[PDB]
């Protein structure tokens, strides 16, 4: 019983991780794509506070 429950759990502790990876990477992209448009604005705020 334990024998058919250990392999069960193994295949679920693979399924769970597999989905986490897909969100993680898509939400990694969502932090890239959000920045690269509001990118010149950051450089502006930085520049403006180094040169005084």
């Amino acid at each position: 019983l334990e024998a058919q429950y250990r392999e069960r759990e193994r295949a679920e502790t693979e399924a769970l991780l597999a989905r986490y990876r897909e969100r993680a990477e898509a939400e990694a992209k969502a932090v890239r794509e959000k920045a690269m448009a509001r990118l010149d604005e950051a450089v502006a705020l930085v520049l403006k506070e180094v040169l005084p």
């Binding site: 993680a24 990477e25 939400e27 509001r38 180094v50």
Partner: protein, 122 residues
């Protein structure tokens, strides 16, 4: 959950250090720009106004053209060797407050790290 944190931090990094790449490219080609006197003069202003008494407001010698005016307001200017800063030296000893575009850049992701995160993401 750890995997989410790591893949985001990795993504977030690339953007901060590339922002740094664009910012440092601008400072490297700063002398080329005609906005070079306005910057140099304001940096040395806080310096002489601060802890260095202006014994000598030591500069690089090709930024001596672009600060010879405020040599005549304070100090005698003769280098850091970066060509992108101004050391100031005081009459206390030598004192030593160096306001470099490099030095203000290094402490501005540890001194106004908040401000760049708000402008990219919020």
């Amino acid at each position: 959950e750890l995997l989410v944190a790591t893949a985001r931090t990795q993504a977030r990094g690339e953007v901060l250090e590339e922002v740094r790449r664009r910012v440092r490219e601008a400072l490297e080609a700063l002398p080329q720009k005609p906005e070079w006197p306005e910057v140099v003069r304001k940096l040395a202003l806080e310096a002489l106004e601060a802890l260095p008494g202006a014994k000598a407001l030591v500069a690089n010698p090709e930024d001596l053209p672009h600060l010879e005016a405020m040599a005549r307001e304070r100090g005698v200017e003769l280098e850091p060797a970066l060509r992108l800063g101004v050391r100031a030296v005081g009459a206390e000893g030598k004192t030593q407050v160096e306001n470099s575009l490099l030095a203000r850049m290094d402490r501005a992701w540890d001194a106004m790290s908040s401000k760049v995160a708000q402008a990219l993401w919020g």
